[PDB]
Symmetry: C2
Subunit: 408 residues, 2 copies
């Protein structure tokens, strides 16, 4: 299928549609850097807790009793206007004390508690100081990292695998999804308060992404899952001395960085290895600016532009996956959710029929998304394997399915 | 009771006795810095495993089955001459996969595996390179720290509490005891290989000492149990720049160090607080030399000599506790061990009667031990609370009991 080139002009109709249609209104879009362009979450979240409780009650008719107490306690704590001190103390107890079916229910309870913390902050029921007292605890950071990784894996891994974008899942881009908005406010508060906390959280999160099979590799990592390696990275970031003949105690880190850059740039290396090296290098540069930079042997070997290209490709594939799941939800006689367990309650389910002008806006969104990407990626022979090829394959897949779903 | 002053001369008789009598032969003594002076562990360790197995078999007559498989597997693996590669792979599986009674048995199995690793290294059945491949793994270091702390707590905490020396238990001196010799070889190998590993292990060990109630305090620590704090300490040790107007990013550490020094030196502070501050400062200075030093405000405020005095006091109290437990074992109709669960098997039990000249050597050992201490401690008014007082009280206790135990 030929790729699309329709520039970027007259996008008023699409911009309005995305700002007024669920779930697009609860998220941003890449179509925002081009220089050519609440009060409902409460009732939505309340109904999800009611459905979870109803399923637990039924299973006890066949330690489930313990799960029901926690579920009832969270519902009780959320719909009551009490003192901030009491809310903090009560919620801390629940989170710290927490078969295939049992694990799934257990994780949802943990995630709902964080959603409840999130709703109270936005409604000014708790101040900024009380929030920081909670989330700056090392145990809270480890809970945030593990719950984010595990919840993301539970919901979209099978969907992503059936379409073929699982290899491009990026830890640095899991907070852009509409269901993970609460994590972004917490990260933003931590960055403003103390930049070192956001970097430590990022390092932990990627370590857990590695541990739980999101980034598979035969060889063990060389930067994550080890307190000494974080200590070395921290020591390196705090250095006014820009390595004028540095010491032998930190000269092994540059060799490891160079080996990964060599592997990434090596066009003969296996696809699986290059993407792993990309994910490793992307996190390091985002949270430790300048660690992967080394003048003189970077200007000839175009590196910066290649990283930008792969990062744009990853973002685009995620937005396409969300659009695909959306279109696949408007099918007659559905009675099931495509966004994971306890995602959309029956009361707030997506309407079965198409609203007037929706089809045209969706096709325009798709076309503008593919046309914006092409004007930025690097077209050459050394990289056309991690960027152009997957984008073309995805375009081929989306254009084949759309004419089928729009005809009942 | 008047304190003892008999100098140090003609100690040939005592030195020989300690080198030929169990368990003194399996340990060192402080009487070694004064300028005036195997093949059995195998059968001892083998018999202890047989007694543990025999008790598990009996309890199954009332998941105990799982514990018996591990116990049988360790006995099978130890008495067989196989390839180093197979031993490494088999032992790793056991250690990583591991009521009040159940926990005690579970910890002993873990400790025995480390004792088996220790025996193979000394008999040259495994090389130095294979040993380092195992013990340099982060998980192995965490296992070493937790098992050391928990095993030490299981065996001597009640004994130490009944005599009154529990507050002076020092993490930096738990490897001098005859039963913890295997830990010292591992620490020495790590220091020679990479000094940063011994410091990281020490930091973890003290963090676990704090976590498991060995060093109680109302307020949370400010240096341990937090990866960011280790990162700050590491960054500080790697600094050729000796803080000529340092940066604001590490100026909060000196305030925290100064607050602890202020508390330690404050004669009006509670006993519990001063000893906690002492233990915190002692670990920092041992593993991060120079961190607690600050010229000009240290020479007038005698600090170095006070730390030396408390450290000597702690060592002396530990040696006295071992002597007390030894004398208390030679009592008619005993049929029980004073050195903890599965410490001394019936076959190798301590003889009931006294060997000729033993009583005189024990009294000489005690007298020389108390006389050597007095010639080194600081005698003043600002510290005579953490050193002289406990030593006098201990002397009073030991002299009252000895004339009773030596008369049947």
């Amino acid at each position: 299928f030929p790729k699309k080139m329709i520039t970027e002009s007259n996008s008023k109709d699409i911009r309005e549609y995305l700002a007024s249609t669920f779930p697009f209104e609860q998220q941003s879009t890449i179509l925002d850097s081009v220089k050519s362009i609440f009060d409902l979450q409460l009732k939505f979240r309340q109904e999800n807790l009611a459905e979870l409780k109803d399923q637990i009650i039924l299973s006890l008719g066949a330690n489930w009793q313990k799960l029901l107490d926690y579920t009832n306690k969270l519902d009780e704590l959320s719909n009551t206007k009490i003192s901030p001190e009491e809310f903090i103390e009560e919620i801390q107890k629940v989170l710290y004390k927490v078969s295939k079916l049992y694990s799934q229910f257990n994780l949802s309870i943990q995630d709902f508690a964080l959603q409840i913390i999130h709703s109270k902050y936005k409604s000014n029921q708790i101040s900024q100081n009380d929030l920081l007292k909670l989330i700056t605890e090392d145990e809270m950071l480890k809970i945030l990292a593990k719950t984010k990784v595990l919840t993301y894996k539970m919901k979209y891994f099978d969907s992503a695998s059936k379409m073929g974008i699982n290899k491009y899942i990026s830890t640095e881009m899991m907070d852009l999804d509409w269901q993970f908005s609460h994590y972004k406010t917490f990260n933003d508060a931590l960055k403003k308060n103390k930049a070192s906390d956001s970097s430590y959280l990022g390092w932990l999160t990627h370590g857990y992404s590695i541990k739980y099979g999101l980034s598979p590799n035969n060889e063990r990592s060389m930067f994550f899952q080890d307190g000494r390696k974080y200590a070395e990275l921290y020591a390196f970031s705090k250095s006014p001395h820009r390595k004028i003949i540095p010491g032998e105690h930190l000269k092994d880190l540059l060799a490891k960085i160079n080996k990964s850059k060599g592997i990434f740039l090596d066009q003969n290396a296996l696809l699986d290895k290059r993407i792993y090296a990309f994910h490793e290098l992307n996190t390091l540069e985002t949270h430790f600016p300048g660690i992967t930079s080394s003048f003189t042997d970077d200007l000839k070997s175009n590196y910066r532009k290649k990283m930008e290209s792969v990062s744009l490709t990853c973002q685009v594939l995620q937005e396409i996956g969300n659009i695909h799941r959306f279109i696949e939800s408007k099918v007659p006689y559905h009675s099931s959710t495509e966004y994971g367990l306890f995602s959309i309650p029956k009361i707030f389910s997506i309407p079965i029929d198409y609203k007037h002008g929706e089809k045209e806006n969706l096709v325009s969104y798709v076309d503008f998304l593919y046309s914006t990407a092409h004007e930025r990626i690097l077209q050459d022979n050394s990289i056309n394997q991690l960027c152009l090829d997957p984008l073309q394959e995805s375009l081929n897949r989306i254009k084949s399915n759309i004419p089928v779903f729009f005809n009942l």
